[PDB]
Amino acid sequence: AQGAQQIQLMRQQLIRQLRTGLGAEAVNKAAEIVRAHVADPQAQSATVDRFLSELEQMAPSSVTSRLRAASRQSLAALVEKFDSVAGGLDADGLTNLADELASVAKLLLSETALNKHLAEPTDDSAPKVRLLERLLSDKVSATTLDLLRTAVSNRWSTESNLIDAVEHTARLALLKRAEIAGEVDEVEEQLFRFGRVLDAEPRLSALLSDYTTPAEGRVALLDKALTGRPGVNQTAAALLSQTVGLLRGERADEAVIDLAELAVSRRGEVVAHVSAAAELSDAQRTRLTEVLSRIYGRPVSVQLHVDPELLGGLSITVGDEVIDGSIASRLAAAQTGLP
Amino acid sequence: EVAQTLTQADQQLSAQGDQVRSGLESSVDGLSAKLASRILGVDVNS
Amino acid sequence: TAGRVVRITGPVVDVEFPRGSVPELFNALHAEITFGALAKTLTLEVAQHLGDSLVRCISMQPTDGLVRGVEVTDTGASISVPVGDGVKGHVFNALGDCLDDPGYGKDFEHWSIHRKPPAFSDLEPRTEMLETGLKVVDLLTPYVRGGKIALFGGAGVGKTVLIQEMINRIARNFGGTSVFAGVGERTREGNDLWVELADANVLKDTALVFGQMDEPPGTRMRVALSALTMAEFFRDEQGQDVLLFIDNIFRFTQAGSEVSTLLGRMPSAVGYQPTLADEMGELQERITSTRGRSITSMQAVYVPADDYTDPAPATTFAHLDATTELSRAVFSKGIFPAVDPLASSSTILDPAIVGDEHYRVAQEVIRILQRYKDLQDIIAILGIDELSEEDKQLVNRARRIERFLSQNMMAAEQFTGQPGSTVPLKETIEAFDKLTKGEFDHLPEQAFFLIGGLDDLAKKAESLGAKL
Amino acid sequence: TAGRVVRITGPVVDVEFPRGSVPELFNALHAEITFGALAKTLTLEVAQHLGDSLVRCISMQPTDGLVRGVEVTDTGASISVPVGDGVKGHVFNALGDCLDDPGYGKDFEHWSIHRKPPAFSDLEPRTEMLETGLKVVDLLTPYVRGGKIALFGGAGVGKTVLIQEMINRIARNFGGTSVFAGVGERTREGNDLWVELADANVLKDTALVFGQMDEPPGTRMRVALSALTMAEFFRDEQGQDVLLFIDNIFRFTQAGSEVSTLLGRMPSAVGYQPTLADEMGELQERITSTRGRSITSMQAVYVPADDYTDPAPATTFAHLDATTELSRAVFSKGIFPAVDPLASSSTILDPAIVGDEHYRVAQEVIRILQRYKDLQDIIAILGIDELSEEDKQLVNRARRIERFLSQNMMAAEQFTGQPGSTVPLKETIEAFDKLTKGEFDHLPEQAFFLIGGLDDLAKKAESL
Amino acid sequence: IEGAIEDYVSSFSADTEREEIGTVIDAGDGIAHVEGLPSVMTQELLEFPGGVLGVALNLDEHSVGAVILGEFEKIEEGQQVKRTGEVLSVPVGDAFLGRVVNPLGQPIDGQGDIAAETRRALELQAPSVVQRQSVSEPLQTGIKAIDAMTPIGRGQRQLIIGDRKTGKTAVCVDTILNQREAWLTGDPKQQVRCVYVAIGQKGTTIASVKRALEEGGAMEYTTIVAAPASDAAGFKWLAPYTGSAIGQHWMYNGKHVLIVFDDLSKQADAYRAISLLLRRPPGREAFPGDVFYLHSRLLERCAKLSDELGGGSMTGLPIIETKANDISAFIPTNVISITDGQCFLESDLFNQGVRPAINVGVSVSRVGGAAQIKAMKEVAGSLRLDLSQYRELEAFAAFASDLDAASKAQLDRGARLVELLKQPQYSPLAVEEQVVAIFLGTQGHLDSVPVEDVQRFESELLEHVKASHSDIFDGIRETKKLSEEAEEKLVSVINEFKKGFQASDGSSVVV
Amino acid sequence: DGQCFLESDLFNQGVRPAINVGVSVSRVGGAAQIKAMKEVAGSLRLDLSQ
Ligand SMILES: Nc1ncnc2c1ncn2[C@@H]1O[C@H](COP(=O)(O)OP(=O)(O)OP(=O)(O)O)[C@@H](O)[C@H]1O
Ligand SMILES: Nc1ncnc2c1ncn2[C@@H]1O[C@H](COP(=O)(O)OP(=O)(O)O)[C@@H](O)[C@H]1O
Numbered sequence A: 001a002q003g004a005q006q007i008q009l010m011r012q013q014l015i016r017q018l019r020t021g022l023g024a025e026a027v028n029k030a031a032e033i034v035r036a037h038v039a040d041p042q043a044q045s046a047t048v049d050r051f052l053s054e055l056e057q058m059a060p061s062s063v064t065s066r067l068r069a070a071s072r073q074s075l076a077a078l079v080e081k082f083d084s085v086a087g088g089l090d091a092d093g094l095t096n097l098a099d100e101l102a103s104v105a106k107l108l109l110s111e112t113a114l115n116k117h118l119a120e121p122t123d124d125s126a127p128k129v130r131l132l133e134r135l136l137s138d139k140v141s142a143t144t145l146d147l148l149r150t151a152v153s154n155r156w157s158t159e160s161n162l163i164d165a166v167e168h169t170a171r172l173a174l175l176k177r178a179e180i181a182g183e184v185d186e187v188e189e190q191l192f193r194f195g196r197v198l199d200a201e202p203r204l205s206a207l208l209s210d211y212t213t214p215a216e217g218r219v220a221l222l223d224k225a226l227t228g229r230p231g232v233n234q235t236a237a238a239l240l241s242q243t244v245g246l247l248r249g250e251r252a253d254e255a256v257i258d259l260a261e262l263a264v265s266r267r268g269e270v271v272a273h274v275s276a277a278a279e280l281s282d283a284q285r286t287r288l289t290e291v292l293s294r295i296y297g298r299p300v301s302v303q304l305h306v307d308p309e310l311l312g313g314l315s316i317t318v319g320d321e322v323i324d325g326s327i328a329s330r331l332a333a334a335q336t337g338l339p
Numbered sequence B: 001e002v003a004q005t006l007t008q009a010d011q012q013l014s015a016q017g018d019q020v021r022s023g024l025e026s027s028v029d030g031l032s033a034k035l036a037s038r039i040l041g042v043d044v045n046s
Numbered sequence C: 001t002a003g004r005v006v007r008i009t010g011p012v013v014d015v016e017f018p019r020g021s022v023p024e025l026f027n028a029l030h031a032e033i034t035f036g037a038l039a040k041t042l043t044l045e046v047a048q049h050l051g052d053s054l055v056r057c058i059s060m061q062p063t064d065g066l067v068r069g070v071e072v073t074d075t076g077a078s079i080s081v082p083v084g085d086g087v088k089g090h091v092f093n094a095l096g097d098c099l100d101d102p103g104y105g106k107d108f109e110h111w112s113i114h115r116k117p118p119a120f121s122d123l124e125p126r127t128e129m130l131e132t133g134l135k136v137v138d139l140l141t142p143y144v145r146g147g148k149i150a151l152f153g154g155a156g157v158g159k160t161v162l163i164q165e166m167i168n169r170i171a172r173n174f175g176g177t178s179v180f181a182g183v184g185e186r187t188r189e190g191n192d193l194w195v196e197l198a199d200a201n202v203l204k205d206t207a208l209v210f211g212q213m214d215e216p217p218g219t220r221m222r223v224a225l226s227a228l229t230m231a232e233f234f235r236d237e238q239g240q241d242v243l244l245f246i247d248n249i250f251r252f253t254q255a256g257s258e259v260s261t262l263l264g265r266m267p268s269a270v271g272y273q274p275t276l277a278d279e280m281g282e283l284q285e286r287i288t289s290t291r292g293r294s295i296t297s298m299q300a301v302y303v304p305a306d307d308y309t310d311p312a313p314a315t316t317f318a319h320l321d322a323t324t325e326l327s328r329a330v331f332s333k334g335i336f337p338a339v340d341p342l343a344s345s346s347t348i349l350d351p352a353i354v355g356d357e358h359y360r361v362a363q364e365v366i367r368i369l370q371r372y373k374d375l376q377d378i379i380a381i382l383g384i385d386e387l388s389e390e391d392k393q394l395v396n397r398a399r400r401i402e403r404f405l406s407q408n409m410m411a412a413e414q415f416t417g418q419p420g421s422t423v424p425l426k427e428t429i430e431a432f433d434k435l436t437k438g439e440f441d442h443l444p445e446q447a448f449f450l451i452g453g454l455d456d457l458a459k460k461a462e463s464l465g466a467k468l
Numbered sequence D: 001t002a003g004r005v006v007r008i009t010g011p012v013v014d015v016e017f018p019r020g021s022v023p024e025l026f027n028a029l030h031a032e033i034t035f036g037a038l039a040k041t042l043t044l045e046v047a048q049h050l051g052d053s054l055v056r057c058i059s060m061q062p063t064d065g066l067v068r069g070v071e072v073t074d075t076g077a078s079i080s081v082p083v084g085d086g087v088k089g090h091v092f093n094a095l096g097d098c099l100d101d102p103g104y105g106k107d108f109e110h111w112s113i114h115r116k117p118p119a120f121s122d123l124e125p126r127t128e129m130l131e132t133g134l135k136v137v138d139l140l141t142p143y144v145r146g147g148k149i150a151l152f153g154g155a156g157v158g159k160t161v162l163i164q165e166m167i168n169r170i171a172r173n174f175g176g177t178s179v180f181a182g183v184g185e186r187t188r189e190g191n192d193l194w195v196e197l198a199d200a201n202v203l204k205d206t207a208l209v210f211g212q213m214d215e216p217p218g219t220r221m222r223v224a225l226s227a228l229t230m231a232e233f234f235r236d237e238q239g240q241d242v243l244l245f246i247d248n249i250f251r252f253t254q255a256g257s258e259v260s261t262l263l264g265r266m267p268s269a270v271g272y273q274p275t276l277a278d279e280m281g282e283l284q285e286r287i288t289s290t291r292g293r294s295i296t297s298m299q300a301v302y303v304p305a306d307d308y309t310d311p312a313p314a315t316t317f318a319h320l321d322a323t324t325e326l327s328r329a330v331f332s333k334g335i336f337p338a339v340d341p342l343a344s345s346s347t348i349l350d351p352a353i354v355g356d357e358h359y360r361v362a363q364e365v366i367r368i369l370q371r372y373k374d375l376q377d378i379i380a381i382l383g384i385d386e387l388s389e390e391d392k393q394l395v396n397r398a399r400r401i402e403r404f405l406s407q408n409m410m411a412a413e414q415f416t417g418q419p420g421s422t423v424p425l426k427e428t429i430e431a432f433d434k435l436t437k438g439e440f441d442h443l444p445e446q447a448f449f450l451i452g453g454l455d456d457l458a459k460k461a462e463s464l
Numbered sequence E: 001i002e003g004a005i006e007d008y009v010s011s012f013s014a015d016t017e018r019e020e021i022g023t024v025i026d027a028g029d030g031i032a033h034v035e036g037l038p039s040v041m042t043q044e045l046l047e048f049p050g051g052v053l054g055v056a057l058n059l060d061e062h063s064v065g066a067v068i069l070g071e072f073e074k075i076e077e078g079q080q081v082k083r084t085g086e087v088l089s090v091p092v093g094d095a096f097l098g099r100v101v102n103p104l105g106q107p108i109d110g111q112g113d114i115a116a117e118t119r120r121a122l123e124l125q126a127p128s129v130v131q132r133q134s135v136s137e138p139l140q141t142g143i144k145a146i147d148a149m150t151p152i153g154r155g156q157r158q159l160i161i162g163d164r165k166t167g168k169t170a171v172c173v174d175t176i177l178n179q180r181e182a183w184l185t186g187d188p189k190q191q192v193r194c195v196y197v198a199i200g201q202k203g204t205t206i207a208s209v210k211r212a213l214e215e216g217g218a219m220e221y222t223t224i225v226a227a228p229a230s231d232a233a234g235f236k237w238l239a240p241y242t243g244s245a246i247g248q249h250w251m252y253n254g255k256h257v258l259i260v261f262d263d264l265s266k267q268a269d270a271y272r273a274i275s276l277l278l279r280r281p282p283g284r285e286a287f288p289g290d291v292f293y294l295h296s297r298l299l300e301r302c303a304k305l306s307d308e309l310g311g312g313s314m315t316g317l318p319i320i321e322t323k324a325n326d327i328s329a330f331i332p333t334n335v336i337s338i339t340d341g342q343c344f345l346e347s348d349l350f351n352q353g354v355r356p357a358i359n360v361g362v363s364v365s366r367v368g369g370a371a372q373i374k375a376m377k378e379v380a381g382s383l384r385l386d387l388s389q390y391r392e393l394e395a396f397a398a399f400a401s402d403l404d405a406a407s408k409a410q411l412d413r414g415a416r417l418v419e420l421l422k423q424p425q426y427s428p429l430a431v432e433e434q435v436v437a438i439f440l441g442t443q444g445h446l447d448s449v450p451v452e453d454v455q456r457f458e459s460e461l462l463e464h465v466k467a468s469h470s471d472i473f474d475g476i477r478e479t480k481k482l483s484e485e486a487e488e489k490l491v492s493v494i495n496e497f498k499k500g501f502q503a504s505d506g507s508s509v510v511v
Numbered sequence F: 001d002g003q004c005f006l007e008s009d010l011f012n013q014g015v016r017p018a019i020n021v022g023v024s025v026s027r028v029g030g031a032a033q034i035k036a037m038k039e040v041a042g043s044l045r046l047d048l049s050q
């Protein structure tokens, strides 16, 4: 009986080797076939359309991460104060305010001890206000006085949080002036393209990210190499130059994508980093935006990132949640699914 | 007895696997085509 | 796409790569030391991914002269060693480079030294005695052909002499291939073994892979994997019986623990790495025979400070079919091989395999030696006169038995100046059956010291004035 | 004002609260595990204030299935157990939840398990004897009222029957009650004890609190305090004399060590928690006599490696007043309770506490038994013939004494239908004085099995 | 077999779904830290690319520490990690009998798929203190020493603790083999289903154990959960829980289960490795603060259920390897505290020929006589005192002249009984045969026999009765007691056999 | 390549050099001796151990 066991075991192991091989060559040939079939644009379009239908039939659902309750609430109060006060400010006034805020943030970053003293939480903000107005009233505007007083009065977990709050207020003022000019979409697209190209060439991004080197040289590098171009929005250029000027302990591409995220969130929308092997039709884009908005309720600003490696299909990531329709992902699942 | 049965089983198993490999080769294309057809949500005539 | 060295601390190097170019774990990376005196090419094995595109690597060569920021190249694969019949008769290092003929084997097929062990369904227990001619081994620790044999013991108890003896007795007439892995041992011993194999004409059939105790921890970690890869190729591709000799396997674990804290891992009990059992298990489980494919492996296992409870030998014990445990106490008595018959074990020492008579004689010998061990303290304090008559008779028998388990080995001729001997298993069983029955109680115990069979016993008794 | 989980590492959970809502140390918090298979309400005990509004807590239940960010509710008080007469006859866990009837006692008065010992003034300067009524215990190892008794004994030695006997005597003689604290309790043994107490009809006089083997270390650390809180309510509020059983106290110590390790504290000597003495003292100092009422404790003690100098037993014995060892040898003889009169001891067996007559009688009994034990080996090897005449006389007297230390116990009625006896202390003293003097050596040995005082001895002698 | 793969491909299909993802932020030594996955539970099963599996053990605001259960070398920074929304669980059913599976319930014996009746989470709570009843049914190991001196009941946890090469696996395998007759009975109240968990053993050792079970026909009712030495620390840590889950599925359906853990010390080592790699605080012997909890929650799931829950039971036989016979080490101390009784095996006894090498002086069973049948209770009553007196007197072996008659008789009886408790390997004895052998020993029927012959005598006599006087065994088995008439017939049979028996030295054994 | 174990016990009792023969050993052995010494001292260490 155990000899029968042994011979049946050898037979079954031969069977298993057969199955494993057959499966390996089968999946390889299937990959070749699909890649051959997906070369033509029509297959790409049809895959996108069917996946969009699948998303349409999908049912809806419900759902700054680094900051915490105190810091998040203080920043919310600061942005509300800005919305209230700087609403009537003029575009040139907005640029002046942004420049003053960036200069103040640079001063705080360079002068660590003053940042500590101004950032240490305190129930009574009167001393903080007194020191801030004593040191700044000389070289800032009244609206800047009010914004800085509001920021310092509130609470933050650490000094870096205060620096981030000041930079965020300046960036949001720049975005306010951008929307005032009516080119909000233009700056959105420019920022996203800049982030993508910066991610593509990590060498330049890392070179910029070195805060050890004086920031004037790096911002000049950005101006002459990338930010200085014919088709570059001036507002986006200024925002990116400011962001790189304040870079410290952060990598440039991450900062740029965060800039784009904040800019889109300024209108309340949520960015959906769509990925596909080819650009979609305008009707396809509208359908995608509508279906994603329905799924997540809030309007969604779809951003297309072409990547031929998906072999057709779409991959939509938003808020740490991903719907993966990529054909490459399906092929990987099929391969790993083999016995 | 079991030793002789096992050695003959091994050699005939090698022969059977060898002759099965060719039979598998002539039929893998259809299996791969069906896989690629159903993976894409649409039939591929290839 | 190349990385650059960020941190250098002894054998551990941190390397930063561009996003998306981070090498896979266990990949081989190359760095250059250009300082003239120590110029060389470092091979680094990726040990960890630290995040932010940094990898922590173990260097295979000393990092002296290495500089921060130097280019680091990724080979895209693990460390690989040459495989095939060509490796026979040649000496390699952990990286696969031939030492006797530098440049040899570069064109051979190369196999990665990292491999999964055989599937559980392919494992068949091995139960077949491998007769050696050593009385103690054949009687009380019968070795298994295609099984796993270990020689445990502390420093300087005869592990290497016994490994060389087993080479002489087994590999000298082996019909297959032999692989000797020198893991973190003396270079002088490696040279002596190379010369001995060349003289014995066994080298032609043997592949030697050496990583000495002067190598950095990475080389001592990976040399065993390299030799094991050669053995695995011979088992799975050439389809021939393989002899795998490893000395000393404990050095693999020791080298692993040397870098454990530099790799950031909190130490475990007795200073060992937390992953001792897992790394040992992977390596050991690769050292096995599979159905129809034989690897008779013989490992020397060093017992730190003679402490058999130490986690390294204790963890190793579970991986063996037969274990000859050498004792410092037996060594200090002049008994060689210094085997502790009460502590050694064999999985095939049962009536079903070795037979009723062999098992009976072995059990009787062990019982007598255990009783003698119990009576040692009484004899030391109160003297032997206070023992019962049967206890005195048993003590005499046990002393003669412990002396007779001693044997003059060929590999020991360099020390004793006395030629070795080989005792057939049947003669061993008959002789120890006679001993346990008291058939040799009239001979002086000195007649039983470092001899072969009963003929040698009669000769020595004649030389001492006795006669059987 | 509710917190949220931020970190989970086994039973250790970090919880963040708003600025003004940080719970006090040892407060009980409630989180929820909603995963269907493992759904439960998780109890966390605040162990440290990490700062930045973060607290580190020990989960009283396994955290398997817990998610980061789920709400955590502060209950405003530490672990509180139900008290009152209603806890008698029921089984509770360390958190006060009734196990034999879930939801039972949820409306009772609830007392925090973290309480201070009686104030220095409130303590009784004079140590008092607890007259149990058992001849061996009263004579050789008298118990201290409000003190601590260590219990040692293997399996099948009457340990459970002895516990039942003490429950009976505290319930009947003193009109008191019992609380059993099973620290690191084996579930099988806990079920056995519950069923046996129900069968003995003494469960009504006992409150069982089980912190079982398969719970995280926090519950095993706090179960002793829970049971002690029930006993403290019975003493201070009900004005009763309580008997508190702890099995095993060493497991309370070991759970404390495990919790200390989980919180990252550096281990002290031999790997125990740095505050081992402090924790043991906080537990033991609450067991005492205050304002005319006492909690007496009998505690099973495990000695690691039989090393009495080990930090755990070394700290525990700093608080133990008496020792009672149960012997396989005595039990095999049929002597119940199987107390070892030579290995057992009491700290108050001194003339200054129990008087000179009691001390003299007990010392004479101990001397006779020790001499008999010395002669036991001779008797076993060479037989009683080789013994001297004085040796034979002493052997007979010692056999009669060692058999008169046996007693018909209250808890033994359910086994041997005969009811138990309660020998007054003076009666026991005089009876054993007479036995030692040699005023009963003529009577047969069998007449000394399982009887009370001298009246029962006379009756059993007549019956033979 | 091409049809086999054709069926899978024709049946294979995938569908997109809103998935929560994280990214591997670092990886090393079998651990991976993955950011994201905000809603991941503790102990949730995560899937990394290439079908790699991990368990989320360490959750903080930054990342999730995950133990990778295999193929860790495939883990890479930046890889996408998906949550499964499920804690660790394994399939369970009757199809697992005779199969070898890994700690995930996946067959590793190469005999095809396993039809799972259902799935069971590995961390389902043990039966409560009110869901149990007293352990009162014998679990016959077939080993005379255990069944007489430290009896095991159904639902008990009997630790088998000893140094290496003392016979612990031998004892457990003998128990499993002894369950063969109960299995053949066909009655679920008598049948015992066996689970053998192998942790950290080399694959060939597991193959040898399976071969031994095959020889005795035990694999018809035995399941092996194997986590060999090459497995990841995750599998070594989880295997006992997988075996326990299968056993619990059987236990809650009124069945009786015997689970062996060979051995829990290797599981403790694997868990310590995981905890240290996750930077959890170490304590004594570098173990985490909850290793005792590990083993205690594992072993409290072995229970005897009440009749309200079907009355099923699971008996645990954890194995512990001590070093230098130091039972006061950390893990031996914990497991000894947890279990109901302990069988201490010793190398010195083994080398003395005392096999199984159980030290009856220290071996205990807190359940005790409640787990024995009435006959065994009667015959085994005197064994404890007899052996204790024998060990007391053994110092006087050569001085029997100096000993009074009672002491010399005690010494001779003790030697006879020590020989009686000896048993060959792979030879479980039925309870009736054990009763008869112990009766021989304790009733003075071995006094006339030479010591060195006792064993053979015993065996031969047992073969005689079974051949000619099987009514004695019948009576004992059906009634579970030794009747007066059966006892008299047994005495007469013993005396006649003694008439027929011949000692090794040749002297008669009569009277 | 071997060691000479010096013991204070042997030194005190007059054995100077206090080499503990039972545990002291040379891993080169006879190769490190001239032929005459190897001839007259082949088993000396084992003889003193015994
Ligand atoms: N009753 C017995 N009679 C004879 N030999 C036995 C007996 N029990 C076990 N042995 C033998 O003793 C040796 C050790 O047995 P086993 O491997 O079961 O023990 P162990 O303590 O589990 O060992 P390990 O540490 O290797 O896991 C084996 O050779 C086994 O055959
Ligand atoms: N069979 C033997 N006969 C005589 N001497 C021996 C024998 N085996 C070992 N020795 C002595 O003990 C020393 C230690 O042996 P070796 O095996 O090289 O060390 P280790 O046991 O540490 O590997 C040898 O160099 C030799 O001098």
Ligand SMILES: Nc1ncnc2c1ncn2[C@@H]1O[C@H](COP(=O)(O)OP(=O)(O)O)[C@@H](O)[C@H]1O
Residues within 6 Å of the ligand: D153, D154, D155, D156, D157, D158, D159, D160, D161, D336, D337, D409, D412, D415, D416
């Ligand atoms: N006074 C007594 N009379 C009759 N039987 C007793 C007496 N004391 C103890 N026993 C018996 O001894 C056994 C002791 O077991 P148990 O009560 O569980 O204590 P332990 O936990 O020490 O074993 C009981 O089963 C009981 O039957």
Ligand SMILES: [Mg+2]
Residues within 6 Å of the ligand: C159, C160, C161
């Ligand atoms: Mg050596």
Ligand SMILES: [Mg+2]
Residues within 6 Å of the ligand: E168, E169, E170, E262
């Ligand atoms: Mg084993």
